[PDB]
Scaffold this active site. Structure first.
Site, PDB file in Angstrom:
ATOM      1  N   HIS A 125      -7.300 -13.401  -7.299  1.00  0.00           N
ATOM      2  CA  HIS A 125      -8.013 -12.316  -6.620  1.00  0.00           C
ATOM      3  C   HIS A 125      -9.428 -12.259  -7.215  1.00  0.00           C
ATOM      4  CE1 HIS A 125      -9.157  -8.341  -5.321  1.00  0.00           C
ATOM      5  NE2 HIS A 125      -8.159  -8.405  -4.453  1.00  0.00           N
ATOM      6  N   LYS A 165     -12.790  -6.019   7.214  1.00  0.00           N
ATOM      7  CA  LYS A 165     -13.564  -4.883   6.699  1.00  0.00           C
ATOM      8  C   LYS A 165     -14.615  -5.214   5.634  1.00  0.00           C
ATOM      9  CE  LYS A 165     -10.153  -3.591   3.108  1.00  0.00           C
ATOM     10  NZ  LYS A 165      -8.843  -2.912   2.851  1.00  0.00           N
ATOM     11  N   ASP A 217      -1.276  -5.128  -5.424  1.00  0.00           N
ATOM     12  CA  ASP A 217      -2.707  -4.952  -5.222  1.00  0.00           C
ATOM     13  C   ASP A 217      -3.452  -5.417  -6.494  1.00  0.00           C
ATOM     14  OD1 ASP A 217      -4.922  -4.137  -3.602  1.00  0.00           O
ATOM     15  OD2 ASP A 217      -3.833  -2.294  -3.032  1.00  0.00           O
ATOM     16  N   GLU A 218      -4.713  -5.784  -6.353  1.00  0.00           N
ATOM     17  CA  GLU A 218      -5.434  -6.306  -7.522  1.00  0.00           C
ATOM     18  C   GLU A 218      -5.409  -5.326  -8.694  1.00  0.00           C
ATOM     19  OE1 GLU A 218      -7.275  -5.485  -4.499  1.00  0.00           O
ATOM     20  OE2 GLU A 218      -7.705  -3.552  -5.454  1.00  0.00           O
ATOM     21  N   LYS A 250       0.874  -1.187   0.000  1.00  0.00           N
ATOM     22  CA  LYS A 250       0.000   0.000   0.000  1.00  0.00           C
ATOM     23  C   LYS A 250       0.913   1.241   0.000  1.00  0.00           C
ATOM     24  CE  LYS A 250      -3.532  -2.610   0.690  1.00  0.00           C
ATOM     25  NZ  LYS A 250      -4.614  -2.816  -0.372  1.00  0.00           N
ATOM     26  N   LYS A 301       2.264  -9.014  -2.152  1.00  0.00           N
ATOM     27  CA  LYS A 301       1.570  -9.048  -3.447  1.00  0.00           C
ATOM     28  C   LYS A 301       1.289  -7.695  -3.988  1.00  0.00           C
ATOM     29  CE  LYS A 301      -3.029  -9.957  -3.390  1.00  0.00           C
ATOM     30  NZ  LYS A 301      -3.555  -8.598  -3.795  1.00  0.00           N
TER      31      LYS A 301
HETATM   32  O1  CAP Z   1      -7.265  -4.105  -1.739  1.00  0.00           O
HETATM   33  C1  CAP Z   1      -7.479  -4.544  -0.556  1.00  0.00           C
HETATM   34  O2  CAP Z   1      -8.313  -3.987   0.211  1.00  0.00           O
HETATM   35  C2  CAP Z   1      -6.696  -5.752  -0.104  1.00  0.00           C
HETATM   36  O3  CAP Z   1      -5.426  -5.631  -0.724  1.00  0.00           O
HETATM   37  C3  CAP Z   1      -6.517  -5.828   1.426  1.00  0.00           C
HETATM   38  O4  CAP Z   1      -5.838  -4.673   1.898  1.00  0.00           O
HETATM   39  P1  CAP Z   1      -5.584  -4.609   3.508  1.00  0.00           P
HETATM   40  O5  CAP Z   1      -4.811  -5.873   3.883  1.00  0.00           O
HETATM   41  O6  CAP Z   1      -4.757  -3.332   3.681  1.00  0.00           O
HETATM   42  O7  CAP Z   1      -6.933  -4.534   4.144  1.00  0.00           O
HETATM   43  C4  CAP Z   1      -7.347  -7.017  -0.595  1.00  0.00           C
HETATM   44  O8  CAP Z   1      -7.229  -7.031  -2.026  1.00  0.00           O
HETATM   45  C5  CAP Z   1      -8.784  -7.315  -0.147  1.00  0.00           C
HETATM   46  O9  CAP Z   1      -8.658  -8.127   0.987  1.00  0.00           O
HETATM   47  C6  CAP Z   1      -9.652  -8.009  -1.184  1.00  0.00           C
HETATM   48  O10 CAP Z   1     -10.915  -8.297  -0.581  1.00  0.00           O
HETATM   49  P2  CAP Z   1     -11.361  -9.866  -0.475  1.00  0.00           P
HETATM   50  O11 CAP Z   1     -10.234 -10.614   0.156  1.00  0.00           O
HETATM   51  O12 CAP Z   1     -12.649  -9.899   0.322  1.00  0.00           O
HETATM   52  O13 CAP Z   1     -11.644 -10.326  -1.908  1.00  0.00           O
HETATM   53 MG    MG Z   2      -6.122  -5.388  -2.853  1.00  0.00          MG
END
Ligand code: CAP
Ligand code: MG
Ligand code: CAP
Ligand code: CAP
Ligand code: MG
Ligand code: MG
Ligand code: MG
Lengths: 122, 464, 465, 119, 228, 117, 122
Positions: free
Chosen positions: B283, B323, B192-193, B164, B190
């Site tokens: 993801h 969250k 981020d998506e 992040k 990783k």
């Molecule tokens: O973009 C985000 O918010 C995250 O990188 C988490 O960040 P944090 O670790 O800083 O919260 C993940 O991609 C989410 O967990 C995806 O949601 P899910 O797993 O429900 O598909």
């Molecule tokens: Mg993410």
């Protein structure tokens, strides 16, 4: 405003957009060929145009060669003689187109080429 | 004789006496008909228009056999406590589907029926995928056991972390963040998506610096490390190009956003990863656009089964306590659908059909999003060892930085694992287990102090 | 200032009501329903943060870059008329957040994770303002409206198509027979159903061979250019391209793809292949209603429609309004213009939240299909105009006399509507009379009119503006 | 001509001619065909060849480009051509232009009986 | 109606009231007309012949929209202190250009207008490249920040050096010169612009010895080195 | 006198056909044929699509003008001195050429060149 | 039950499935073209249909272009004038098909196209 015709006006390259050549017109083109020191030759064909039967790759067309009437007239210095051969070719092949060409053997290329006879109805 | 004209769908497609075949694909639809439309007709319209039928009689049905090919609504039941809602069960013959193609399966079962004017809402809750169909899919490139064997990691959940801020970091800062996190004890970091290739950071530069970081942290710690490099792209050629460079770099794992990239690209990437030894983290970006509401859409368990078929070694499956929404019982149900070989029908966990995977490898579920050290006992209790627990904010938000944040999470997890193994009850003693580890880990104590009051307690939108 | 670890509200950084949008920003209009207790500004800020740069707790790495330059920001929130807890939150995303040419990346950010946040009860993306600076990075349609009409030499009326039926279960040879009979009666096109890919009852390459034979036989008989959309939708990209390559070898004019079930990464690759090989690309929107039917949650079809014009397609289904699938009239006219026009001004009466400038990206031909028949021809011609394809599957193969007569009925009905319109008749008011008048000339149309005279699909739409 | 034209010590510099020795020119292919070969391929002898750039320079669609091409070639020109700046653009993509201009070349050649081209 | 014949370019291509669009490519030309040619006509000829127009009226303008596509001279100003010289500003619609192709952009804006008989001289001084066009180009493979990050070099200008004599050195002497320069503290050395592949030194031999030199100097100094 | 500073020997490298193009029309045909000779391509863009009757008539006008110039030259006429008369004579045979000649009879491009030897 | 004919009913795109257009029918289509502010143009051909002689790649067909009759009628405001030109074209080419088209130069596409004359026996 006139519409350019779509049929009955097929063409034969150089001089074919002018009125039909008279015998004197043909003589003058042959005299030009001879004064320029080019070799005249007659060619003839029952098919007047190119087509693409054997291949369609770039630069390939069928129908570009016509048949040679005798041999090129090496050493010719008389336009009248060329006209006599044209008359012999039309007598032998009245249903063929006959063209007269002239070439320069130094540059090795045809420098003049025109239709000198078209069969009846063409 | 051929009789032109319109007749009710139920005359051909509502077959309550039908006994399903072991080769049929079964669907459970939550259907809300428009007023005046009988539930049998609504269920029949869904079966017809997702299989062989259209709106008026066609003479060409006579060239073939609708008895052999038609989808059929074989059972309808009202939903207790809801008004005008029913679960309609539809059976589809195996021959209707293209082998190995999740795309084709979804095209039939959810292609056009959700927009019918005669329905107010429609949700696909579950699909029974018969062994005769699932055997036509490669499935996970590796699967749980093979992944643990390749990475030499056993006995505890794996630990990850999304870098992040989500977007805006340069390639070199990405690798800096990756190295500091991995060297503190995380197994993975990783992309981020939504980190693919952008003006602030092009992918090939990121891949070079993240490889440098993976190998530096691995050399320093002595443990195998990985950073999921995102192959998600605008075209299939760019996606494969990215995977090919990860292969050249020799890294262990790449990732893909299977729903936004799509199943046709995802299945191609899973085959490439199997043929080139790359683990594939999946993801589920965009799933909640489809799977959040109870009245309409597709439940995530269907999207989860589809991923296990198309192929992935990991897939996010929620946190329950973080969250993003994830009701506990329904999550335990699809976690078993993702990992286990045989999952018995259990409506208390939203499993409408017994699902037999006939040795298709399991997929490691990934819990991620808004979690921190105090959640470690609950996460360990809910998911068990075959999971990846990811802390993005929960690592890069540590007051002392990334390496201490990673060490706090690795210490918290190992303290939970040791306690669990000794017989302690994580559900009841978790807070005490974390406080005890704070006695010898200053890194964990600092994390515990920052996040002790943070909890995400909201009523879920979808309940069983 | 110093890094302070811990959680703070998203609105402190991501709710910026003073922000003036930039002409390079991508703008999103979200219909947001917050959980009780969550202020709308915090719900809108959370959606902006978690679709752009933020996470749930403060991270020190924000200090390595500039959130001022990269953050998504909720710049306006407006309550929804008639709702006590629903708002339209407007979010601006800097151009640099997106991968050029990738619809996949755009959706991954804007709709990737925010729809699952616990703090929301529901979320729907209603519209996106795609700036010219971003759309120019996409190829868009392989050909587009003008080019397609020029390739097919078809002008002056909607194009006519037809999905072969039963949907599944027919053999390759019977598919080609059905195709030939339909095209020879007057349709311009027939097509594989969206779910006809390759299956035990009919493998794709056999279907492609017999349908090509059918296309060429009907074209030779009628003297009009014909097509049958051959489906390239497949389980893998290599199979998709393999199918498109064989349609190219056969010389046919058009293929199709299910862009949402195959997916945007595959679709974008296929659109490039089609541009490079002269193939028109018909796009089927299978699965869209899973996402776009409900007003409270999901994504409106107009966003999926803009995304397809970017990823690329020459045709896309856009509803019928009057047929068997839902399609509210005003919102349909709004996205039909978003698909075809160069510049569409904001018009909330048609659900257009943002002015959209396509800077000469080609238009996509909208396709009306699903439960329509001859009596609908005037209304369809009036709603969509000439730049459309009207498809009659059951409306052709359900004719009492078979496919060629069914095709002729539809072709005659359409031509009668076009002639009447061109002479100044009001299709919206004289349609039934225009169709009846053509029945005198066409026994085939008279028979279709008799079978379907009592068939109408009148249900209240689920999504209303 | 790489760097010398920018020297401070000069006010101006123009290269007027180069003597290319045979030892260097023989290392080049040169024209793909050349005058003689081109005349022989096209069967055109005895007069200058005639061409024509389609106009307006930019802004015409592919189909209108092919229409303009067909009408010009059928009246007696040997060639028509894309304008120098006609490459591939929003108003006309190249592959569409290539398809319609080929149709035009072959239609005018069939009508007139003379070999035609459109660059 | 179509009216055949010649008319001044300014009647269609001099549009002083035009307000430029944010998507237009703008050009600033320093134009010196021939005596007798009005500056408005010179500017209009430059706009016409670099966009849509030619020397006589063509009926095909009617198949399309010159309002949409024409380049247009929208402002002309004399250059103070010069005789018979003006800056003519021309606006070109975005649609005129092939995405990602500097070649196409130059082909239109500077393709034929510099040779017009009606001008004595013409110089293109500047172009306003709109974001809608520049976003269709990749641009630098890496760019300043990424280059510094890859080479781990910050806080000062980088230092290079072209090997000399420009031509005539063998591959092995090229690598010798490269190594000695890099080991003394330069970040880079380079082939001269005209060093490509020649009888005195073939490229592949040079590439082998210069790689050997780059790596030897890097190993000795501990700093990342390169030779272009 | 022709700006050739060095003797140039091409050792049989093929020749390139020069192309004359840009602002030319039927009245220029004699001068172009005289300057370049047969090995050339003469291109008429505006000089074809600007014909009052359209493209095919515009092409025919140019083809007729060119063939009349070639025929006259071959018969020994001086193109440099009789060009206007040769073009006028062909107008009798070709209404298409007559129309082109009428539209462009007053059009000439006479400006001092910037580069002189 | 009637069988759709397999011969003698070749088609010509828009309006060809309706009964033969009368002169008043043709006038009304031309008035529509003109009120819509489109430019009319006539085209003609002795070949009425497309074919594939030179290539069979996607989107390539021969026979899509017909020949232009004069030029598009820019500035035309009288349908009668368009009919007069149609009469002149049929008189000049009685053995050709003649079609009337109308285009919008802003969108640059033909918005209407229909056969206005078929030669005897076609
Ligand atoms: O973009 C985000 O918010 C995250 O990188 C988490 O960040 P944090 O670790 O800083 O919260 C993940 O991609 C989410 O967990 C995806 O949601 P899910 O797993 O429900 O598909
Ligand atoms: Mg993410
Ligand atoms: O499968 C079908 O139902 C159709 O083939 C229509 O069949 P009929 O012509 O027999 O109705 C179409 O794919 C739908 O129109 C798709 O819906 P939409 O156009 O709304 O995306
Ligand atoms: O763009 C043009 O102006 C032309 O197409 C001519 O158009 P017209 O035939 O309508 O004049 C040519 O490209 C120029 O002749 C190039 O100049 P040059 O030959 O000097 O390089
Ligand atoms: Mg369908
Ligand atoms: Mg040019
Ligand atoms: Mg140098």
């Amino acid at each position: 405003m006139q519409v350019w015709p779509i049929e009955g006006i097929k063409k034969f390259e150089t001089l074919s957009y002018l009125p039909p050549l008279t015998v004197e017109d043909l003589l003058k083109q042959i005299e030009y060929l001879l004064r320029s020191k080019w070799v005249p030759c007659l060619e003839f064909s029952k098919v007047g145009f190119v087509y693409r039967e054997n291949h369609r790759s770039p630069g390939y067309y069928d129908g570009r060669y016509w048949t040679m009437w005798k041999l090129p007239m090496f050493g010719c210095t008389d336009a009248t003689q060329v006209l006599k051969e044209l008359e012999e070719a039309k007598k032998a092949y009245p249903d063929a187109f006959v063209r007269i060409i002239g070439f320069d053997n130094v540059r090795q290329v045809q420098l003049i080429s025109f239709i000198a006879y078209k069969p009846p109805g063409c | 004789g051929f009789k032109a004209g319109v007749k009710d769908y139920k005359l051909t497609y509502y077959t309550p006496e039908y006994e399903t075949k072991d080769t049929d694909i079964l669907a459970a639809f939550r259907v809300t008909p428009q007023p005046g439309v009988p539930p049998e007709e609504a269920g029949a319209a869904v079966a017809a228009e997702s299989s062989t039928g259209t709106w008026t009689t066609v003479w060409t049905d006579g060239l073939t056999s609708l008895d052999r090919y038609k989808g059929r609504c074989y059972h309808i039941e009202p939903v207790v406590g809801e008004d005008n809602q029913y679960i309609a069960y539809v059976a589809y013959p195996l021959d209707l589907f293209e082998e190995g193609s999740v795309t084709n399966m979804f095209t039939s079962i959810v292609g056009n029926v959700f927009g019918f004017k005669a329905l107010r809402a429609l949700r696909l809750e579950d699909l029974r995928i018969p062994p005769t169909y699932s055997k036509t899919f490669q499935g996970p490139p590796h699967g749980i056991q093979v992944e643990r064997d390749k990475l030499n990691k056993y006995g505890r959940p794996l630990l990850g972390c999304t870098i992040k801020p989500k977007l805006g970091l340069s390639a070199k800062n990405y690798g800096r963040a990756c190295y500091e996190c991995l060297r503190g004890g995380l197994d993975f970091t990783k992309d981020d998506e939504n980190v693919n290739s952008q003006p602030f950071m092009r992918w090939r530069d990121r891949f070079v610096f993240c490889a440098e970081a993976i190998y530096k942290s691995q050399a320093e710690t002595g443990e195998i490390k990985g950073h999921y490099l995102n192959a998600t792209a605008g075209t299939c050629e760019e996606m494969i190009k990215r995977a090919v460079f990860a292969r050249e770099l020799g890294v262990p794992i790449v990732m893909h956003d299977y729903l936004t990239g799509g199943f046709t690209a995802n299945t191609s990437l899973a085959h490439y990863c199997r043929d080139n030894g790359l683990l594939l983290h999946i993801h589920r970006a965009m799933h909640a656009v489809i799977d959040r509401q109870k009245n309409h859409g597709m439940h995530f368990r269907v999207l989860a089964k589809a991923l296990r078929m198309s192929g992935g070694d990991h897939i996010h499956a929620g946190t329950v306590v973080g969250k993003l929404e994830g009701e506990r019982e329904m999550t335990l149900g699809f976690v078993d659908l993702l990992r286990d070989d045989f999952i018995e029908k259990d409506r208390a966990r939203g499993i409408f059909f017994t699902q037999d995977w006939v040795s298709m490898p399991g997929v490691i579920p990934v819990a991620s999003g808004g979690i921190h050290v105090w959640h470690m006992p609950a996460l360990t209790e809910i998911f068990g060892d075959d999971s990846v627990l990811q802390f993005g904010g929960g690592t890069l938000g540590h007051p002392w930085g990334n390496a201490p944040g990673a060490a706090a999470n690795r210490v918290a997890l190992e303290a939970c694992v040791q306690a669990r193994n000794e017989g302690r009850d994580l559900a009841r003693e978790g807070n005490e287990i974390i406080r005890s580890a704070c006695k010898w880990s200053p890194e964990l104590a600092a994390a515990c102090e920052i996040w002790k009051a943070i909890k995400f307690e909201f009523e879920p939108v979808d309940k069983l």
